[PDB]
Amino acid sequence: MFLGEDYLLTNRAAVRLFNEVKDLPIVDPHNHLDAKDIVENKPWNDIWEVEGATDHYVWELMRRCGVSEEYITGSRSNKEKWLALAKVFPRFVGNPTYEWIHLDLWRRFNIKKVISEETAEEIWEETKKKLPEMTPQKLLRDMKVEILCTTDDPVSTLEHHRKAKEAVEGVTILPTWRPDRAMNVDKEGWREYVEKMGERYGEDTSTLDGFLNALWKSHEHFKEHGCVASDHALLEPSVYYVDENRARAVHEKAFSGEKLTQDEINDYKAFMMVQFGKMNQETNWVTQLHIGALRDYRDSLFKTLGPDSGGDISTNFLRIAEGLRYFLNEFDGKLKIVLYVLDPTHLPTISTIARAFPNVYVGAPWWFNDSPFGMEMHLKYLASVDLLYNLAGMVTDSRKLLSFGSRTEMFRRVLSNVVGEMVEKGQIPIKEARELVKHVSYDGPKALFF
Amino acid sequence: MFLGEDYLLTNRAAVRLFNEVKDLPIVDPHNHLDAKDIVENKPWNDIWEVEGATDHYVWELMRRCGVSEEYITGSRSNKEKWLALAKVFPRFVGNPTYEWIHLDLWRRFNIKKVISEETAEEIWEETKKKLPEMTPQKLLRDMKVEILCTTDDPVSTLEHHRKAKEAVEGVTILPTWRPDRAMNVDKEGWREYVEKMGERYGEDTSTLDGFLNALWKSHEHFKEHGCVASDHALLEPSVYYVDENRARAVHEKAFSGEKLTQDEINDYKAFMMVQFGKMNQETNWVTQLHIGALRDYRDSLFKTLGPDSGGDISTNFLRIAEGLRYFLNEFDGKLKIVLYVLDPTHLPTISTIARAFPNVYVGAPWWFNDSPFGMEMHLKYLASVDLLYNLAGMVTDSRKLLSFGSRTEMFRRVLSNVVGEMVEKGQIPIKEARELVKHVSYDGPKALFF
Amino acid sequence: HMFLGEDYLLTNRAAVRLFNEVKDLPIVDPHNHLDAKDIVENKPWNDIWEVEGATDHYVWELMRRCGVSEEYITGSRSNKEKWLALAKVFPRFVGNPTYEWIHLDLWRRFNIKKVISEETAEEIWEETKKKLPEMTPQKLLRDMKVEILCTTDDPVSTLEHHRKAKEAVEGVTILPTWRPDRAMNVDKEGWREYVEKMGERYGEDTSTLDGFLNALWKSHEHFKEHGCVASDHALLEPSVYYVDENRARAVHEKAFSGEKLTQDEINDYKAFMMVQFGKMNQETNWVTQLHIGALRDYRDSLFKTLGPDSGGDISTNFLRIAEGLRYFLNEFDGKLKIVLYVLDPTHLPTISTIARAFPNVYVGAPWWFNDSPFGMEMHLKYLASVDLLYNLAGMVTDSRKLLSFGSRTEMFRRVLSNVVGEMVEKGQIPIKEARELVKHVSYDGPKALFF
């Protein structure tokens, strides 16, 4: 039964439901794809390129198996990198990556082999012959992707998005406004950034107003490219009321290597968030908040590869509710907000929070949590406290095209398995199941973000 | 089959168990019913009155579905309020309310239709014709409710409880001593309250001793009406050792609009809790503690409807163990205490706490948590750490009569499903399962509170 | 329906093949609370009570939770009376792992397939009495196929019986494990007496940090020489930061003179000692086990009466794990094999992601209140979805009683095999790798990690 028809499906009801939704087009509110690569439409050369070269999950697991970096991010050939992953792939059994990579192979290349030393070479060769006919745009069309949203920096000119709107066929590729750098006054680089922003937008950014003026122009810049959302990464959401003169003072201090106090950083951040909210009210943008990623926990990884290189963890010790309280009461009914949490242990907080504010939505299982297990828990749980029906929608969070489909498949099977179970336990009539499941997989998120 | 016989049952064993307990009478340690309504024995007029008019859960989800307040707590006719709920009811699929309301329809009115715009009018008309023969006392008798306990304020006269003991034929309706207002010195009307209390009990309440004297008379007042329990709502249980002079100082400060320090509030609360424990020792009352409800989180709801209007949430950031420690060691073996937790994430704390103090009991899944999902997790989990057998007992927490039976059904099915499973995996012989299940559904709780 | 039979805990066919694959693998037990002297003396037990309840604080708890006075728990009533009370009340244990463990021992070891209750009490006591003679530790160690054990030992210990066990016990390797908690706990009443004992046995001026360290290192070398390969550490709130030796020295000297030390002093002292235990372990390549989250002696009456490990320790969800481990972890990144255990399952995600980012870190088995078919199913499925089930540190018995070993080991392997079975049948894992995964986790993996 490996990756077969009833993969992840445990009841008959689940199977009708999945059959009802499997061919719905993919709507992807958030991913880490680059538009330039779609516009250039260049094939891939290797399964390594496609599957491991830019997947930090793969790097992690690979390191967790005792495979030196030579073959992870280092200077060994793709083919060698590939052979090592396969050598060790059977130890990944149980973890979503094991399933995703195989799903790509079976659904995209139609190579139904199981990965291991024994199979490594035959798979490498079979994929090499097939990779050429494969292009992003061909893949986008094959996987029925209707809309994508990438994550972009306020400073970006959105050039490729422009070109994609022009020439890319049946996909809508929207940018998403992520102003985290702007917000992070603790980051070395903040100043260079604040300096770049004034440059690109024509503003005295060494002043808060000028920087805000620059952020607003950035936001308008994004509006004009069909953008409908802001993504925000926060460890401990701490939003309270922050005076402009204090904000102004801190902002100016920041331009002069002052080690700012925690209060200064916090005040600065609380303030910037309220301003992102104001900006987004004026455009009716969905405000996504990704809470709880402790980043660059692992020093050696930071100093060597830097961010997003495999050393971020979650922590359970976070004041969520009292930290969002001001923001949420402030934009109550005025702003669509979607909440994500990295520690599933915090679902209840966000879930109850969403139960009490019609403008707030619970996101899909986020990072370490997007796994059949996490999806089962996240959904069953969320269904019993708010409404499954308002789930913001599946998010690929993917760095690689092939994932899209397989990621989308996994999600829909699990969601359809979850509802199936409830249908068979007699909690949900089949009719409304069929409707619930369709809404969540497509109509709902489409309506919400677009 | 929706809401059929094996609703919530997943194994044969479960079915024997459920059949064993389905006809046991209902014992309801805690609910938010009014005795006056039971004594007056007035029929309801509408399914709206019966199902939505006073159910804040229904208010929540309706708001979560985008239905304006006009049709929630506003000025639209019951019939319009009803039609809106049904219009949108299919989006509730997955949430316990969807099941509860249908269960009432099927078990009480014998209307086996599924709620939707298509069905709205036919249901409304069928229920209107049947609602007359329906009364509280007839319903109490029908649903086999043997004992209820409402929640009452220390100031109450318990008049209708008196009347109900006199005239209500096969139900025992007991009041429950909830002294939260007395405890909450941060609340606006604390003073007015402290003033009322001395008035009804004849004490100079602007003095701690006089207030205490007043609370004790209240407690004796309750004793005389067959009361056997105190309910306490606490966000962050913080009980330590508080001097009467300090307590006395704070109490007097509180009578003169002093913005008291957090330490003053805390000390005053710590002190009041210990004195509630003392009072309960002398009467051997069960002390219920409901931990973790962040209330009136949503401002607009507070300013508009006020409390219990749909804006309370849970939060995971609570120091439970070290906050209960003083209390618990203090009343170790001297007081029956039941713990409830709003965030399921905190079960392990309370569960291990209960595992170490024979006077401490773990309550049923509490608020956002009473849902087939919540019950399954709460129970399996609790069973593996302490003893399912000492579970305090199912609690309806309901504001509406009809719920009682359906609430009681759901619970017993799930409980019986959970033990069924363990019987089928060979962890529990069927004989002790039958015993376990019967004890938990009736005998245990009845013995524990009565 | 069938209780404690062949498919006990098994919910799918795949699970059954997997379990049959591993049920006969020998037991490797990285951590337990056994005493080597009892193994060396090889003395039979007298009663089921002795064997099952006399020294099992879980049984003490549940009995107290059933309303049975201490007379019959740790008090002065005869074993037989203690036993009869336990049975009287045993049916109320239904659902809790102890109910299943004790029965498993009866059925797998004594072959007494009866179910425990008042009705059965006397017939079980009499059947076990006749069988208990032929039963010995060493006979049991051989019967239950235990290849390796590791006890928990205090740095002051002379490891005498471990010596004798190496010599005369054939078939089993009984290793000591270095637990320096007392040394670390400067808040404890007898810390000083301890610090004094340590210098005595190791010949050092312990009123001094260097001397105490010198003493700890000698203890560590003392353990090395008895084939020890691990240190166990119990911490509530791991708070490891950077602590200067002069401050450490200052605090240590203060501690020798009844000074109520400040929380910072205690914390500093602990942070410092942990980094030093890490250093000592680097030099020997010892596995560093950290058991996080036990609030102990929470219940006073139990403390004043029986003291520690008597049934009054609880878990708490309010712990800063990640930022507390951060210095340690970044400090020994790639240099030290660390295994993490968490007492509140709600903290798994932290340790699990932590382990996902450091190849030298391993997630332990479900620990205390969590080792239960329920805890194991959750712990495992969960861990599988975030790091690799395949690197699980390995099952740990944690047991204070021999008979448990096998039953403990059985429960675990069934559940592990039930969990993997499920994923095999949902089509997430080919059967070949499942067979491999399951065998690795049950034996080869844990063996190579600790040994």
mmCIF file of C-alpha atoms in Angstrom, chain A residues 127-347:
data_model
loop_
_atom_site.group_PDB
_atom_site.id
_atom_site.type_symbol
_atom_site.label_atom_id
_atom_site.label_comp_id
_atom_site.label_asym_id
_atom_site.label_seq_id
_atom_site.Cartn_x
_atom_site.Cartn_y
_atom_site.Cartn_z
ATOM 1 C CA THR A 127 15.023 11.398 -13.777
ATOM 2 C CA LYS A 128 17.809 12.845 -15.914
ATOM 3 C CA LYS A 129 16.125 11.738 -19.122
ATOM 4 C CA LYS A 130 12.763 13.081 -17.962
ATOM 5 C CA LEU A 131 13.890 16.403 -16.397
ATOM 6 C CA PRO A 132 14.245 18.321 -19.666
ATOM 7 C CA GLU A 133 10.602 18.143 -20.740
ATOM 8 C CA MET A 134 9.930 19.470 -17.328
ATOM 9 C CA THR A 135 9.630 23.118 -16.792
ATOM 10 C CA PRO A 136 8.245 25.319 -14.097
ATOM 11 C CA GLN A 137 5.444 26.607 -16.321
ATOM 12 C CA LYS A 138 4.772 23.145 -17.643
ATOM 13 C CA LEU A 139 4.753 21.969 -14.040
ATOM 14 C CA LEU A 140 2.598 24.820 -12.908
ATOM 15 C CA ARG A 141 0.121 23.861 -15.617
ATOM 16 C CA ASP A 142 0.369 20.130 -14.883
ATOM 17 C CA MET A 143 -0.164 20.546 -11.141
ATOM 18 C CA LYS A 144 -3.186 22.808 -11.776
ATOM 19 C CA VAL A 145 -1.822 25.802 -9.834
ATOM 20 C CA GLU A 146 -4.213 28.699 -10.263
ATOM 21 C CA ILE A 147 -2.626 31.193 -7.827
ATOM 22 C CA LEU A 148 0.683 31.574 -5.971
ATOM 23 C CA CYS A 149 1.976 34.119 -3.564
ATOM 24 C CA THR A 150 5.691 34.494 -2.964
ATOM 25 C CA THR A 151 7.284 36.278 -0.008
ATOM 26 C CA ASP A 152 8.983 39.519 -0.863
ATOM 27 C CA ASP A 153 10.882 42.279 0.756
ATOM 28 C CA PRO A 154 9.495 45.780 0.810
ATOM 29 C CA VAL A 155 12.662 46.965 -0.984
ATOM 30 C CA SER A 156 12.033 44.662 -3.941
ATOM 31 C CA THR A 157 11.125 46.170 -7.317
ATOM 32 C CA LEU A 158 8.818 43.232 -8.145
ATOM 33 C CA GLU A 159 10.286 43.091 -11.677
ATOM 34 C CA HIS A 160 9.755 39.389 -12.354
ATOM 35 C CA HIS A 161 6.299 39.473 -10.906
ATOM 36 C CA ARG A 162 5.622 42.068 -13.632
ATOM 37 C CA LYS A 163 7.040 39.804 -16.295
ATOM 38 C CA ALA A 164 5.115 36.842 -14.892
ATOM 39 C CA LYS A 165 1.810 38.659 -15.003
ATOM 40 C CA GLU A 166 2.586 39.511 -18.599
ATOM 41 C CA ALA A 167 3.815 36.214 -20.023
ATOM 42 C CA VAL A 168 2.929 33.437 -17.574
ATOM 43 C CA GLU A 169 -0.159 31.619 -18.814
ATOM 44 C CA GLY A 170 -2.669 30.241 -16.320
ATOM 45 C CA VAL A 171 -1.076 31.136 -13.036
ATOM 46 C CA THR A 172 -1.358 34.244 -10.946
ATOM 47 C CA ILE A 173 1.856 34.945 -9.102
ATOM 48 C CA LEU A 174 1.389 37.532 -6.388
ATOM 49 C CA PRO A 175 3.996 39.042 -4.130
ATOM 50 C CA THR A 176 3.489 39.174 -0.397
ATOM 51 C CA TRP A 177 4.602 42.079 1.724
ATOM 52 C CA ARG A 178 7.079 40.884 4.400
ATOM 53 C CA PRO A 179 8.506 43.817 6.379
ATOM 54 C CA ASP A 180 10.436 41.846 9.014
ATOM 55 C CA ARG A 181 13.823 43.437 8.334
ATOM 56 C CA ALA A 182 12.240 46.869 8.682
ATOM 57 C CA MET A 183 10.817 45.802 12.010
ATOM 58 C CA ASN A 184 13.940 44.144 13.409
ATOM 59 C CA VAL A 185 15.993 46.979 14.898
ATOM 60 C CA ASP A 186 18.065 44.340 16.763
ATOM 61 C CA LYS A 187 19.457 42.958 13.536
ATOM 62 C CA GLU A 188 22.922 43.996 12.460
ATOM 63 C CA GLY A 189 22.045 45.420 9.014
ATOM 64 C CA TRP A 190 18.902 47.241 10.036
ATOM 65 C CA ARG A 191 20.539 50.596 9.272
ATOM 66 C CA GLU A 192 21.883 49.588 5.869
ATOM 67 C CA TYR A 193 18.331 48.410 5.246
ATOM 68 C CA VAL A 194 16.699 51.572 6.478
ATOM 69 C CA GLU A 195 19.196 53.406 4.250
ATOM 70 C CA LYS A 196 18.321 51.285 1.186
ATOM 71 C CA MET A 197 14.635 51.867 1.717
ATOM 72 C CA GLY A 198 14.912 55.638 1.567
ATOM 73 C CA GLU A 199 17.089 55.267 -1.477
ATOM 74 C CA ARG A 200 14.613 53.186 -3.434
ATOM 75 C CA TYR A 201 11.637 55.241 -2.203
ATOM 76 C CA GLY A 202 13.164 58.722 -1.974
ATOM 77 C CA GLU A 203 12.848 59.568 1.695
ATOM 78 C CA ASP A 204 14.936 60.671 4.646
ATOM 79 C CA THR A 205 14.841 57.271 6.323
ATOM 80 C CA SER A 206 16.988 58.303 9.251
ATOM 81 C CA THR A 207 13.594 59.658 10.389
ATOM 82 C CA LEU A 208 10.644 57.548 11.432
ATOM 83 C CA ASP A 209 8.174 59.555 9.322
ATOM 84 C CA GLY A 210 10.457 59.244 6.336
ATOM 85 C CA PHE A 211 10.833 55.562 6.934
ATOM 86 C CA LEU A 212 7.091 55.185 7.377
ATOM 87 C CA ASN A 213 6.591 57.277 4.249
ATOM 88 C CA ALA A 214 8.996 54.875 2.590
ATOM 89 C CA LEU A 215 7.154 51.794 3.919
ATOM 90 C CA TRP A 216 3.822 53.131 2.690
ATOM 91 C CA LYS A 217 5.199 53.753 -0.784
ATOM 92 C CA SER A 218 6.546 50.214 -0.674
ATOM 93 C CA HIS A 219 3.076 49.057 0.294
ATOM 94 C CA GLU A 220 1.488 51.015 -2.559
ATOM 95 C CA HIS A 221 4.179 49.633 -4.816
ATOM 96 C CA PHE A 222 3.003 46.161 -3.789
ATOM 97 C CA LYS A 223 -0.684 47.056 -4.124
ATOM 98 C CA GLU A 224 -0.022 47.898 -7.775
ATOM 99 C CA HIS A 225 1.280 44.367 -8.396
ATOM 100 C CA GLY A 226 -1.915 42.767 -7.090
ATOM 101 C CA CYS A 227 -0.535 42.032 -3.639
ATOM 102 C CA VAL A 228 -3.102 41.197 -0.963
ATOM 103 C CA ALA A 229 -1.177 40.285 2.159
ATOM 104 C CA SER A 230 1.526 40.946 4.686
ATOM 105 C CA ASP A 231 3.449 38.204 6.437
ATOM 106 C CA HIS A 232 5.007 38.829 9.836
ATOM 107 C CA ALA A 233 7.384 36.653 11.826
ATOM 108 C CA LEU A 234 7.285 37.143 15.577
ATOM 109 C CA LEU A 235 8.635 35.136 18.467
ATOM 110 C CA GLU A 236 6.731 36.747 21.330
ATOM 111 C CA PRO A 237 4.033 39.003 19.916
ATOM 112 C CA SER A 238 4.301 42.018 22.154
ATOM 113 C CA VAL A 239 1.978 44.695 20.856
ATOM 114 C CA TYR A 240 0.993 47.516 23.246
ATOM 115 C CA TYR A 241 0.555 51.323 22.758
ATOM 116 C CA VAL A 242 3.623 53.188 21.448
ATOM 117 C CA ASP A 243 3.857 56.953 21.180
ATOM 118 C CA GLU A 244 5.339 58.437 17.996
ATOM 119 C CA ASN A 245 7.887 60.607 19.802
ATOM 120 C CA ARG A 246 9.155 57.566 21.707
ATOM 121 C CA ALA A 247 9.069 55.658 18.453
ATOM 122 C CA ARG A 248 10.853 58.573 16.845
ATOM 123 C CA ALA A 249 13.437 58.685 19.604
ATOM 124 C CA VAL A 250 14.193 54.963 19.379
ATOM 125 C CA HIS A 251 14.398 55.082 15.597
ATOM 126 C CA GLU A 252 17.001 57.855 15.739
ATOM 127 C CA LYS A 253 18.933 56.115 18.490
ATOM 128 C CA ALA A 254 19.020 53.093 16.187
ATOM 129 C CA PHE A 255 20.841 55.070 13.511
ATOM 130 C CA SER A 256 23.719 55.560 15.916
ATOM 131 C CA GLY A 257 25.056 52.167 17.065
ATOM 132 C CA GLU A 258 23.233 52.447 20.404
ATOM 133 C CA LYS A 259 22.708 49.124 22.096
ATOM 134 C CA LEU A 260 18.998 49.802 22.564
ATOM 135 C CA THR A 261 17.253 48.547 25.675
ATOM 136 C CA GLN A 262 14.772 45.688 25.419
ATOM 137 C CA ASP A 263 12.006 48.219 26.094
ATOM 138 C CA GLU A 264 13.280 50.349 23.211
ATOM 139 C CA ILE A 265 13.334 47.379 20.822
ATOM 140 C CA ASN A 266 9.951 46.194 22.071
ATOM 141 C CA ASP A 267 8.404 49.660 21.881
ATOM 142 C CA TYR A 268 9.777 50.029 18.404
ATOM 143 C CA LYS A 269 8.315 46.733 17.317
ATOM 144 C CA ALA A 270 4.926 47.254 18.935
ATOM 145 C CA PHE A 271 4.758 50.510 17.110
ATOM 146 C CA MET A 272 5.767 49.194 13.692
ATOM 147 C CA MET A 273 3.206 46.392 13.930
ATOM 148 C CA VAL A 274 0.348 48.809 14.627
ATOM 149 C CA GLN A 275 1.520 50.730 11.602
ATOM 150 C CA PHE A 276 1.562 47.695 9.385
ATOM 151 C CA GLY A 277 -1.993 47.135 10.575
ATOM 152 C CA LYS A 278 -3.024 50.665 9.670
ATOM 153 C CA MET A 279 -1.403 50.325 6.245
ATOM 154 C CA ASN A 280 -3.219 47.053 5.677
ATOM 155 C CA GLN A 281 -6.554 48.405 6.765
ATOM 156 C CA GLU A 282 -6.374 50.956 3.977
ATOM 157 C CA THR A 283 -5.869 48.215 1.442
ATOM 158 C CA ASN A 284 -7.876 45.409 3.040
ATOM 159 C CA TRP A 285 -4.883 43.095 3.060
ATOM 160 C CA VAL A 286 -4.821 39.829 4.921
ATOM 161 C CA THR A 287 -2.312 40.160 7.783
ATOM 162 C CA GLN A 288 -0.537 36.871 8.424
ATOM 163 C CA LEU A 289 1.254 36.437 11.762
ATOM 164 C CA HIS A 290 3.655 33.518 12.124
ATOM 165 C CA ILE A 291 4.288 33.227 15.826
ATOM 166 C CA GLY A 292 7.008 31.334 17.688
ATOM 167 C CA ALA A 293 10.111 30.605 15.632
ATOM 168 C CA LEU A 294 13.298 30.923 17.662
ATOM 169 C CA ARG A 295 15.809 31.454 14.903
ATOM 170 C CA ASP A 296 19.498 30.909 14.532
ATOM 171 C CA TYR A 297 19.462 28.963 17.780
ATOM 172 C CA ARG A 298 22.367 26.939 16.551
ATOM 173 C CA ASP A 299 25.405 29.243 16.392
ATOM 174 C CA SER A 300 27.696 27.168 14.213
ATOM 175 C CA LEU A 301 25.051 27.072 11.551
ATOM 176 C CA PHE A 302 24.565 30.786 11.740
ATOM 177 C CA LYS A 303 28.223 31.725 11.496
ATOM 178 C CA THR A 304 28.672 29.270 8.654
ATOM 179 C CA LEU A 305 25.558 29.285 6.481
ATOM 180 C CA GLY A 306 23.539 31.955 8.273
ATOM 181 C CA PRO A 307 19.727 32.053 8.368
ATOM 182 C CA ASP A 308 17.315 29.391 7.216
ATOM 183 C CA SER A 309 20.096 26.859 7.185
ATOM 184 C CA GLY A 310 18.683 24.301 9.631
ATOM 185 C CA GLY A 311 19.026 25.784 13.118
ATOM 186 C CA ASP A 312 15.673 27.247 14.072
ATOM 187 C CA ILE A 313 13.574 25.668 16.756
ATOM 188 C CA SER A 314 10.264 26.243 18.481
ATOM 189 C CA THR A 315 9.829 27.085 22.179
ATOM 190 C CA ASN A 316 6.783 26.596 24.394
ATOM 191 C CA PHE A 317 7.564 29.513 26.634
ATOM 192 C CA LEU A 318 5.642 32.362 24.947
ATOM 193 C CA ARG A 319 3.049 34.927 26.114
ATOM 194 C CA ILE A 320 0.778 34.844 23.086
ATOM 195 C CA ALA A 321 -2.641 36.049 24.238
ATOM 196 C CA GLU A 322 -1.664 39.055 26.293
ATOM 197 C CA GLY A 323 0.824 40.016 23.579
ATOM 198 C CA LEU A 324 -1.725 40.092 20.734
ATOM 199 C CA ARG A 325 -4.448 41.582 22.814
ATOM 200 C CA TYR A 326 -3.837 45.200 21.921
ATOM 201 C CA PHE A 327 -3.365 44.562 18.242
ATOM 202 C CA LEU A 328 -6.427 42.376 18.024
ATOM 203 C CA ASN A 329 -8.736 44.693 19.953
ATOM 204 C CA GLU A 330 -7.363 47.491 17.901
ATOM 205 C CA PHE A 331 -8.161 45.986 14.514
ATOM 206 C CA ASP A 332 -11.232 44.137 15.700
ATOM 207 C CA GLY A 333 -13.538 43.912 12.688
ATOM 208 C CA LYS A 334 -11.255 46.136 10.644
ATOM 209 C CA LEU A 335 -8.611 43.752 9.400
ATOM 210 C CA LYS A 336 -8.464 40.130 8.277
ATOM 211 C CA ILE A 337 -5.796 38.459 10.399
ATOM 212 C CA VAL A 338 -4.494 34.897 10.039
ATOM 213 C CA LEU A 339 -2.574 33.325 12.932
ATOM 214 C CA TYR A 340 0.073 30.591 12.708
ATOM 215 C CA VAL A 341 1.804 28.969 15.600
ATOM 216 C CA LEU A 342 5.030 26.904 15.540
ATOM 217 C CA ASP A 343 4.420 24.920 18.688
ATOM 218 C CA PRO A 344 1.197 22.965 18.274
ATOM 219 C CA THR A 345 0.912 23.344 22.041
ATOM 220 C CA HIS A 346 -0.247 26.923 21.377
ATOM 221 C CA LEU A 347 -3.114 25.984 19.007
#
